[PDB]
Amino acid sequence: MENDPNLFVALYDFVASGDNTLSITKGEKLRVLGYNHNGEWCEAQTKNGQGWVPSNYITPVN
Amino acid sequence: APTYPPPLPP
């Protein structure tokens, strides 16, 4: 069976700008799928859906 | 992912 994913937490609010970005709120948990070519955008999952968020608006959490 | 850069940390 596949292991539970490790998670991240949102550091700051980010309002989606369209274009497959995802709004996130400080304190939400996220699962990270990956990053774009320069690492500046992060494709993540939250309770609100899936999409791109700024990579430095999130961080690992135990 | 967007072709424009994300906003800087606030």
| Domain of residue A29, CATH code | 2.30.30.40
In terms of residues, how long is chain B? Answer: 10
- Technique used: X-ray
Phi, psi for A57 (deg, rounded to 5): -100, 5
Of B6, B9, B10, the CB nearest to A41: B6
Map residue A8 onto helix, strand or coil: strand
Which residues form the domain of A7?
1-62
Mark out chain B residues that contact chain A at CB-CB < 8 A: 1-2, 5-7, 9-10
Amino acid occupying residue A55: S
Distant-in-sequence, close-in-space partners of A32: CB < 8 Å, separation ≥ 6: A8, A42, A43, A44, A58
**To the nearest whole angstrom, how far is the Cα of A59 from the nearest Cα of chain B?**
13
How many distinct structural domains can be found in chain A? 1
Reported resolution in A? 1.1
